[PDB]
Structure formats: C-alpha cells, structure tokens
Write a protein that holds these residues in place. Structure first.
Motif, PDB file in Angstrom:
ATOM      1  N   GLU A  42     -11.650  -2.579   5.954  1.00 38.66           N
ATOM      2  CA  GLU A  42     -10.419  -1.823   6.197  1.00 38.66           C
ATOM      3  C   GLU A  42      -9.265  -2.372   5.354  1.00 38.66           C
ATOM      4  OE1 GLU A  42      -8.802  -1.956  10.176  1.00 38.66           O
ATOM      5  OE2 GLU A  42      -7.393  -0.322   9.790  1.00 38.66           O
ATOM      6  N   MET A  43      -9.080  -3.693   5.378  1.00 38.72           N
ATOM      7  CA  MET A  43      -8.054  -4.379   4.581  1.00 38.72           C
ATOM      8  C   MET A  43      -8.227  -4.146   3.078  1.00 38.72           C
ATOM      9  SD  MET A  43      -7.954  -7.992   6.618  1.00 38.72           S
ATOM     10  CE  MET A  43      -6.791  -8.934   5.633  1.00 38.72           C
ATOM     11  N   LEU A  44      -9.463  -4.263   2.591  1.00 36.73           N
ATOM     12  CA  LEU A  44      -9.758  -4.103   1.162  1.00 36.73           C
ATOM     13  C   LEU A  44      -9.470  -2.684   0.669  1.00 36.73           C
ATOM     14  CD1 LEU A  44     -10.972  -5.077  -1.637  1.00 36.73           C
ATOM     15  CD2 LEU A  44     -13.231  -4.767  -0.617  1.00 36.73           C
ATOM     16  N   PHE A  45      -9.945  -1.694   1.420  1.00 35.12           N
ATOM     17  CA  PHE A  45      -9.800  -0.303   1.010  1.00 35.12           C
ATOM     18  C   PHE A  45      -8.395   0.261   1.245  1.00 35.12           C
ATOM     19  CE2 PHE A  45     -13.768   1.026  -0.890  1.00 35.12           C
ATOM     20  CZ  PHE A  45     -14.662   0.048  -0.474  1.00 35.12           C
ATOM     21  N   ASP A  46      -7.693  -0.270   2.256  1.00 32.04           N
ATOM     22  CA  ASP A  46      -6.250  -0.026   2.426  1.00 32.04           C
ATOM     23  C   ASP A  46      -5.467  -0.509   1.200  1.00 32.04           C
ATOM     24  OD1 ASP A  46      -6.655   1.103   4.965  1.00 32.04           O
ATOM     25  OD2 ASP A  46      -5.689  -0.534   6.058  1.00 32.04           O
ATOM     26  N   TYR A  47      -5.808  -1.705   0.706  1.00 33.56           N
ATOM     27  CA  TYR A  47      -5.164  -2.268  -0.489  1.00 33.56           C
ATOM     28  C   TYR A  47      -5.413  -1.410  -1.728  1.00 33.56           C
ATOM     29  CZ  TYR A  47      -3.593  -5.344  -4.235  1.00 33.56           C
ATOM     30  OH  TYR A  47      -2.958  -5.854  -5.343  1.00 33.56           O
ATOM     31  N   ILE A  48      -6.671  -1.002  -1.921  1.00 33.72           N
ATOM     32  CA  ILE A  48      -7.068  -0.034  -2.954  1.00 33.72           C
ATOM     33  C   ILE A  48      -6.199   1.228  -2.869  1.00 33.72           C
ATOM     34  CG2 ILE A  48      -8.918   1.623  -3.557  1.00 33.72           C
ATOM     35  CD1 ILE A  48     -10.898  -0.825  -3.144  1.00 33.72           C
ATOM     36  N   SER A  49      -6.089   1.786  -1.660  1.00 33.34           N
ATOM     37  CA  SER A  49      -5.289   2.984  -1.401  1.00 33.34           C
ATOM     38  C   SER A  49      -3.809   2.777  -1.719  1.00 33.34           C
ATOM     39  CB  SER A  49      -5.470   3.447   0.046  1.00 33.34           C
ATOM     40  OG  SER A  49      -6.812   3.845   0.268  1.00 33.34           O
ATOM     41  N   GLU A  50      -3.282   1.610  -1.349  1.00 28.50           N
ATOM     42  CA  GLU A  50      -1.912   1.210  -1.686  1.00 28.50           C
ATOM     43  C   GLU A  50      -1.689   1.180  -3.205  1.00 28.50           C
ATOM     44  OE1 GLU A  50       1.249  -2.492  -0.910  1.00 28.50           O
ATOM     45  OE2 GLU A  50      -0.702  -2.547   0.080  1.00 28.50           O
ATOM     46  N   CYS A  51      -2.665   0.633  -3.934  1.00 30.71           N
ATOM     47  CA  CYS A  51      -2.630   0.564  -5.398  1.00 30.71           C
ATOM     48  C   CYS A  51      -2.647   1.935  -6.062  1.00 30.71           C
ATOM     49  CB  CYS A  51      -3.778  -0.294  -5.932  1.00 30.71           C
ATOM     50  SG  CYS A  51      -3.611  -2.034  -5.509  1.00 30.71           S
ATOM     51  N   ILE A  52      -3.485   2.845  -5.555  1.00 29.55           N
ATOM     52  CA  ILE A  52      -3.544   4.222  -6.074  1.00 29.55           C
ATOM     53  C   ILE A  52      -2.184   4.903  -5.873  1.00 29.55           C
ATOM     54  CG2 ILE A  52      -4.703   6.483  -6.032  1.00 29.55           C
ATOM     55  CD1 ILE A  52      -7.170   4.859  -4.790  1.00 29.55           C
ATOM     56  N   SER A  53      -1.606   4.723  -4.685  1.00 34.54           N
ATOM     57  CA  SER A  53      -0.271   5.232  -4.371  1.00 34.54           C
ATOM     58  C   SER A  53       0.793   4.736  -5.363  1.00 34.54           C
ATOM     59  CB  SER A  53       0.108   4.889  -2.927  1.00 34.54           C
ATOM     60  OG  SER A  53       1.304   5.544  -2.562  1.00 34.54           O
ATOM     61  N   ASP A  54       0.779   3.433  -5.657  1.00 33.41           N
ATOM     62  CA  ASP A  54       1.672   2.820  -6.652  1.00 33.41           C
ATOM     63  C   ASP A  54       1.527   3.447  -8.048  1.00 33.41           C
ATOM     64  OD1 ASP A  54       3.525   0.322  -7.326  1.00 33.41           O
ATOM     65  OD2 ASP A  54       1.965   0.364  -8.862  1.00 33.41           O
ATOM     66  N   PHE A  55       0.280   3.612  -8.497  1.00 35.17           N
ATOM     67  CA  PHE A  55      -0.034   4.195  -9.809  1.00 35.17           C
ATOM     68  C   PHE A  55       0.475   5.629  -9.936  1.00 35.17           C
ATOM     69  CE2 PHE A  55      -2.693   6.630 -12.735  1.00 35.17           C
ATOM     70  CZ  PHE A  55      -2.725   5.827 -13.873  1.00 35.17           C
ATOM     71  N   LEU A  56       0.267   6.418  -8.884  1.00 33.22           N
ATOM     72  CA  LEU A  56       0.653   7.830  -8.873  1.00 33.22           C
ATOM     73  C   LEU A  56       2.168   8.031  -8.886  1.00 33.22           C
ATOM     74  CD1 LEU A  56      -1.928   9.285  -6.290  1.00 33.22           C
ATOM     75  CD2 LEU A  56      -2.085   9.560  -8.773  1.00 33.22           C
ATOM     76  N   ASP A  57       2.898   7.113  -8.248  1.00 27.97           N
ATOM     77  CA  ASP A  57       4.369   7.098  -8.278  1.00 27.97           C
ATOM     78  C   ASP A  57       4.909   6.784  -9.670  1.00 27.97           C
ATOM     79  OD1 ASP A  57       4.829   7.846  -5.637  1.00 27.97           O
ATOM     80  OD2 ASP A  57       4.915   5.778  -4.909  1.00 27.97           O
ATOM     81  N   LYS A  58       4.281   5.810 -10.334  1.00 31.56           N
ATOM     82  CA  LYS A  58       4.639   5.390 -11.695  1.00 31.56           C
ATOM     83  C   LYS A  58       4.517   6.496 -12.742  1.00 31.56           C
ATOM     84  CE  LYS A  58       4.105   0.375 -11.925  1.00 31.56           C
ATOM     85  NZ  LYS A  58       4.135  -0.037 -10.497  1.00 31.56           N
ATOM     86  N   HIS A  59       3.665   7.483 -12.460  1.00 30.94           N
ATOM     87  CA  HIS A  59       3.395   8.578 -13.388  1.00 30.94           C
ATOM     88  C   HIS A  59       3.754   9.954 -12.814  1.00 30.94           C
ATOM     89  CE1 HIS A  59       0.861   5.149 -14.704  1.00 30.94           C
ATOM     90  NE2 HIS A  59       1.317   5.513 -15.889  1.00 30.94           N
ATOM     91  N   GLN A  60       4.527   9.939 -11.721  1.00 34.29           N
ATOM     92  CA  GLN A  60       5.098  11.134 -11.067  1.00 34.29           C
ATOM     93  C   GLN A  60       4.047  12.204 -10.734  1.00 34.29           C
ATOM     94  OE1 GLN A  60       7.071   9.865 -14.066  1.00 34.29           O
ATOM     95  NE2 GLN A  60       7.850   8.517 -12.446  1.00 34.29           N
ATOM     96  N   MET A  61       2.951  11.762 -10.123  1.00 33.68           N
ATOM     97  CA  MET A  61       1.790  12.625  -9.890  1.00 33.68           C
ATOM     98  C   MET A  61       1.104  12.422  -8.530  1.00 33.68           C
ATOM     99  SD  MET A  61      -0.696  10.963 -12.822  1.00 33.68           S
ATOM    100  CE  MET A  61      -2.237  11.459 -12.060  1.00 33.68           C
ATOM    101  N   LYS A  62       1.863  11.934  -7.547  1.00 31.36           N
ATOM    102  CA  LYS A  62       1.356  11.756  -6.178  1.00 31.36           C
ATOM    103  C   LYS A  62       1.093  13.094  -5.458  1.00 31.36           C
ATOM    104  CE  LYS A  62       3.344   8.915  -2.872  1.00 31.36           C
ATOM    105  NZ  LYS A  62       3.921   7.594  -2.499  1.00 31.36           N
ATOM    106  N   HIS A  63       1.659  14.173  -6.001  1.00 26.76           N
ATOM    107  CA  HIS A  63       1.419  15.543  -5.533  1.00 26.76           C
ATOM    108  C   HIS A  63       0.118  16.146  -6.090  1.00 26.76           C
ATOM    109  CE1 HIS A  63       3.484  16.115  -9.402  1.00 26.76           C
ATOM    110  NE2 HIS A  63       2.883  17.290  -9.457  1.00 26.76           N
ATOM    111  N   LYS A  64      -0.399  15.557  -7.169  1.00 28.59           N
ATOM    112  CA  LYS A  64      -1.622  16.031  -7.824  1.00 28.59           C
ATOM    113  C   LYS A  64      -2.880  15.522  -7.123  1.00 28.59           C
ATOM    114  CE  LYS A  64       0.210  16.660 -12.538  1.00 28.59           C
ATOM    115  NZ  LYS A  64       1.519  15.948 -12.446  1.00 28.59           N
TER     116      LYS A  64
END
Ligand SMILES: CC(=O)N1CCC(c2nsc(Nc3ncc(Sc4ccccn4)cc3Oc3cccnc3C)n2)CC1
Ligand SMILES: OC[C@H]1O[C@H](O)[C@H](O)[C@@H](O)[C@@H]1O
Length: 448
Positions: A110-132
C-alpha cells in the motif's frame, strides 16, 4: 633498507594473489555452468517441470506477430529509483525520476504503490496533463507470472524489496487500486513488462535483429524470443514469444554450490533474500561492491591491507559502492582515482594498498563478467539449436549500470560470450533511450 622493504612487498603481493586466485574460473568451469543453466532453461519452459525449475522462463505475452498512435505514459520500478516517462508514438520523450524512500521499499505494498501514485500525480502537474487519461505501460523489474500482457502476479520480490502484501497478487491490480485510492488522476493500464523486455523492444526499434534483452545493473536477468511451440505454458505454436528467464534465481536449488566462496555466503546471509537470487548475487551491482568490501576485510584480517586496521566506513555494510569498483578499475596508473575513494572511506592508503584494492576489484568484476557470459551463452546456443541454424546472426540489447559504466566488464563479458557460442555472430547494442520507449512501444500495440 630498500631490499627489506622490497622483500616485504613481494611476499605481501604473493599472499594477496593466492587469496584472489579463488575467484578464478577456467573455461571448463564456465562450460559446466552454461550446461547446467541450459538444462534449467529447458525445465522452466516445460509444463511438467516448470514448478520445480529454478530458472522460471516466464511467458511475457510480448509476441513477434502483431500499432496505435498518440501519447503514452511509461513507469519504471526496480532498477534505480522510480521513473515516469511520457512518450509520443507517431518517438519523442519527456521524463522525471523520483527517489524511493527506504520505508516504501520495505514497508507495505500500500505504501509503495501510494508513493508511485503520488509520483505520477507530480509528473502530470509538471506537464499540465492531470486531466488526461492515457494508456500506461509499467516496467516492473521483478518475476511475474502473467495471465496476459496486462495481468500478472508477483512471484517474489528481489534486490532488497520487501513490501508486504504484494507477493501472490496482481501487480497491475496493485497499481490500479493505488490510483483509485488517491483519485487524483486516471490511467488505462494496458501493459506490464520486465526491464529486460523493455530493453529488447527499445533496441529492436533501432535494430530488427534484436531478439535478446539483458540487464546488468542492480540485478542481472535476460529475456529472449522463444518459439511458441517451446513455450508450453501458453497455448499456441505460431511465431515467437518473449520469455523472461529470471536467470538470477539459478543456483537457488543448489546448482552453483561448488562455485560459491565464503564472500558469496556472507553476502547471501546478510541480504534481504537469503538463499535466493544466488547467480545474480555473483554479478549484480547491488552485490558487487559488497563482495569487494568483504574481500578487502579478509585482506585487512590477514594484515595485507591498511596495516590490518579497517576504518568504520570500510566496516559499514554497503559502503563500498559498485560505482567505486568501476572508478577503481578506471585508474590510469597514478593511483589517484583509487586514493580518492579510499580516502573518502576514512582510510590512509599506501601506493601498494591502492594496487591491492585494484586487484581485488578486478578479481570480483572479472568473475562477474565470466559468470554472466555463461548465462548469455546458454541462451544464445539454445536459440541457435531451436531455430536449426548453422550460423546464427543475433543482436543483444543491453542496459544496466554495471554493463554501461564499468571500464572493463563489457570487454571481458563480450569476449567470453563469443568464446562460448560457436557459429554465432553476436552484435551488442546499448539501450541509450531508457526503458520508457520500450514500455510505450509495447503499450502502443497492447492497447488494441
Ligand atoms: C492482441 C494482444 O492483445 N496481444 C497481447 C500483447 C502482444 C504484444 N504487444 S507488443 C508486442 N510486440 C512488439 N511490440 C512492439 C515492438 S516495437 C516495433 C518497432 C517497429 C515495428 C514494429 N514493432 C515489437 C514487438 O515485437 C516484435 C515484432 C516483430 C518482430 N519481433 C518482435 C520482438 N506483442 C500481442 C498480442
Ligand atoms: O533489474 C534486473 C533484474 O533484477 C532481478 O533479477 C529481477 O528479479 C528481474 O526481474 C530483473 O530483470
């Protein structure tokens, strides 16, 4: 006097060489390893013997027979750090890496995959594509029993991963559940590949003769394109399917026992996975530096190094990094590179101390290159036999910090593989563009 010092140095050099000679493997030793590996590979492929084989030969569901266009997200877990990549297939890339906290690797799934999910969220914000909502390929560098390209259970963690509640479960499910728990973005998980497979596909993209992928990094593994008739675990006999050997686990049923040294037993006993990944523990960058450290500690104990007194840092687990092995063997002759490493480890080395350290590094890394060569030779010889070719011309795609960054490993490895593969013309190519391209190219077909 000069001659007393000279006699001292000569005697010490001889004692060091006697200790280091234990790492030697003759051509016949390598051929013996190779033959045992080949037998395990055949056993892993067969329905009757798969469950009792140490080399699992896992079907990947990546095939030779089959592409969609657009934006693709690639993830990578299991090498060094966690990597997120955007790749456009029409290949053009965009990338971010994330350091994994220690408690994420050894806590809960749970901790590992939550962290993965947090990282994906960060990446998508950086490239203005969290809606995609994008098709996603997951490079997941651990043994997986696949039901399809997009579904597979984690058999066991390797390389120090210990996350509870992951083994025996659908890895794609673990990722999907974490994405949902966060509820911050949506992704269509379409493919899961091993890093060997991502490497092979990315290299195939450059050279269509590439039908082998190999990693010599943190861990050591290979994949190859097997005849579907030989892949008994998947119904069908037309064309080829990529098979993930998981050759790192060779020796886990005792197949390497006569070759294991005291240093190997110590590395294994202090590891997160005692008794497992024994072949990988001879080669992989997670273990190579540690093997060198233990050799140096033996030499210290014999009063052959550092006046028989080791520093706190030299006596610290993991402190002799594999990159130090590469750096030591990159020394031009003036001993400066070696001195700098040993100085930062709190030592005060003499010129001969430096020379001894170099010899210890060479002994471990040469054995690693030669052991690895027996593995790849096994794969290549089996492919030549299966394809009934008099002369096989094949390209091997490679990634990993040991293979790429060590000044000598590549040379020693290539020369040994070639000696052990009669009537084979082998071309080696490097995965210059990372796993992400390989994962996305797979995703572009898989999303159909
Ligand atoms: C139907 C279905 O769901 N599935 C499940 C998923 C299955 C699947 N997904 S990807 C895949 N294979 C490949 N994907 C991308 C490339 S890059 C590339 C670069 C240039 C030209 C072509 N490809 C190469 C591939 O393999 C080939 C192709 C030809 C020769 N040798 C190899 C190894 N197989 C197919 C069946
Ligand atoms: O990362 C290189 C290799 O490391 C380990 O051996 C993993 O079990 C394997 O899946 C991976 O390919």
């Amino acid at each position: 006097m000069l001659d007393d010092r000279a006699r001292m140095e000569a005697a010490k050099k001889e004692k060091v060489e006697q200790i280091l000679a234990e790492f030697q493997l003759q051509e016949e030793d390598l051929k013996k390893v190779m033959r045992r590996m080949q037998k395990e590979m055949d056993r892993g492929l067969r329905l009757e013997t798969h469950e009792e084989a140490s080399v699992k030969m896992l079907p990947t569901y990546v095939r030779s027979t089959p592409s969609e266009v657009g934006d693709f997200l690639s993830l990578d877990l299991g090498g060094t750090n966690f990597r997120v990549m955007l790749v456009k297939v029409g290949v053009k890339t965009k990338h971010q890496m994330y350091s994994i906290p220690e408690d994420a690797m050894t806590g809960t799934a749970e901790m590992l995959f939550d962290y993965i999910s947090e990282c994906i969220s960060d990446f998508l914000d950086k490239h203005q594509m969290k809606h995609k909502k994008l098709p996603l390929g997951f490079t997941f560098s651990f043994p997986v029993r696949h039901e399809d390209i997009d579904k597979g259970i984690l058999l066991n963690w390797t390389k120090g991963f210990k996350a509870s509640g992951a083994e025996g479960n659908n890895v794609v499910g673990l990722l999907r559940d974490a994405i949902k728990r966060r509820g911050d973005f949506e992704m269509d998980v379409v493919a899961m590949v091993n890093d060997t497979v991502a490497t092979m596909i990315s290299c195939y993209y450059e050279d269509h003769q590439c039908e082998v992928g190999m990693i010599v990094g943190t861990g050591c593994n290979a994949c190859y394109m097997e005849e579907m008739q030989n892949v008994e675990l998947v119904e069908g006999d037309e064309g080829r399917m990529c098979v993930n050997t998981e050759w790192g686990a060779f020796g886990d049923s005792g197949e390497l026992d006569e070759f294991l040294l005291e240093y190997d037993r110590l590395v294994d006993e202090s590891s997160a996975n005692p008794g497992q990944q024994l072949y990988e523990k001879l080669i992989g960058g997670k273990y190579m530096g540690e093997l060198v450290r233990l050799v140096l500690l033996r030499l210290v104990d014999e009063n052959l190094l550092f006046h028989g007194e080791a520093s706190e840092q030299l006596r610290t687990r993991g402190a002799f990094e594999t990159r130090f092995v590469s750096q030591v063997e990159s020394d031009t002759g003036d001993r400066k590179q070696i001195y700098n490493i040993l100085s930062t480890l709190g030592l005060r080395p003499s010129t001969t101390d430096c020379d001894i350290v170099r010899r210890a590094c060479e002994s471990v890394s040469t054995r690693a290159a030669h052991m690895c060569s027996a593995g790849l030779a096994g794969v290549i010889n089996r492919m030549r036999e299966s394809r009934s070719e008099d002369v096989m011309r094949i390209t091997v795609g490679v990634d990993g910090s040991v293979y790429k960054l060590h000044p000598s490993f590549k040379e020693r490895f290539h020369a040994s593989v070639r000696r052990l593969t009669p009537s084979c013309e082998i071309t080696f190519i490097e995965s210059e563009e990372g796993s992400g391209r390989g994962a996305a190219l797979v995703s572009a077909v898989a999303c159909k």
